[PDB]
Amino acid sequence: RKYYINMLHQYYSEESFEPTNISVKSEDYYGSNVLNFKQRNKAFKVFLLGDDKNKYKEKTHGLDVFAVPELIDIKGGIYSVGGITKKNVRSGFVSNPSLQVKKVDAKNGFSINELFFIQKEEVSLKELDFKIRKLLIEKYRLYKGTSDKGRIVINMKDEKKHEIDLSEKLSFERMFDVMDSKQIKNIEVNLN
Known about the structure:
CATH topology of the largest domain: Ubiquitin-like (UB roll)
Name: Exotoxin 5
PDB class: unknown function
Helix content: 10-25%
Keywords: csgid, superantigen-like protein
Number of domains: 2
Structural class: mainly beta
Assembly: monomeric
Entry title: Crystal Structure of Superantigen-like Protein, Exotoxin SACOL0473 from Staphylococcus aureus subsp. aureus COL
């Protein structure tokens, strides 16, 4: 609604971070398990919730993290949820699934291709959701002009798919889901 959409716009407009090849072990943070680490002067605090709550008790190596802040602290720390993937195994890798943004629920509509590259062999749904929404905000004025009624559909070569409702923020639990980027057949966004 009025305040909820301003929230979406602020959240999905924020700057993201992609620290890579991280070695870390989970620690307690007032009852939540988190991954504390630094890279390129930024300090990160990645929360582990739900099914992944107890997932990195042993020191784990070679992790990549897509971070979006839920809060930035008074010292600049980035508190993010999920976004943990396994780094690319030694090799070149770039996926380039088609991405169409369309309005098809009226007489006068549109359909437009966008160029989307994914440089990780394993990518989080969190990342796809964030980057696509950011593009929808800047190019299509999502949450500032364009209605929040719509969806992002990521179709897998399996024919399975991941659907994201634009009218709500991705749930924290889905911020842990991961997939092989080469298995993404296409991505379709419907702006209703």
